[PDB]
């Protein structure tokens, strides 16, 4: 039972890692669009800092 528990825990945490790796890319694309919108002059630094955080 301990071996099966640890194997299922690893199987779950790898999927968690992949899904967080997708969420990070989504946040990175949103930051790139906010940086473009700030470099053209439509957004301010207050939105750029939130997209950075």
């Amino acid at each position: 039972a301990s071996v099966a528990t640890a194997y299922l825990t690893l199987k779950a945490d790898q999927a968690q890692l992949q899904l967080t790796k997708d969420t990070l890319g989504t946040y990175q694309k949103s930051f790139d669009l906010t940086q473009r919108s700030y470099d053209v002059g439509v957004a301010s630094a207050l939105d750029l800092r939130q997209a950075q955080t």
């Binding site: 002059g41 439509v42 957004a43």
Partner: protein, 52 residues
């Protein structure tokens, strides 16, 4: 602030500065100034008359 917000604020400020000049024109019209320099005749209207 962004540059577009400053452009909007500058546009609104300049529109108000033109509206107050539009008011100053009509305020300058109530003191009817002589358009040219010359000899003035007699006044066809007196004090208390309504003009249009």
């Amino acid at each position: 602030v962004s540059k577009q917000q400053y452009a909007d604020a500058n546009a609104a400020y300049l529109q108000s500065k033109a509206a107050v000049e539009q008011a100053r024109i009509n305020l300058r019209y109530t003191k009817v100034l002589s358009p040219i320099s010359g000899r003035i005749g007699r006044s066809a209207v007196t004090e208390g008359a309504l003009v249009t």
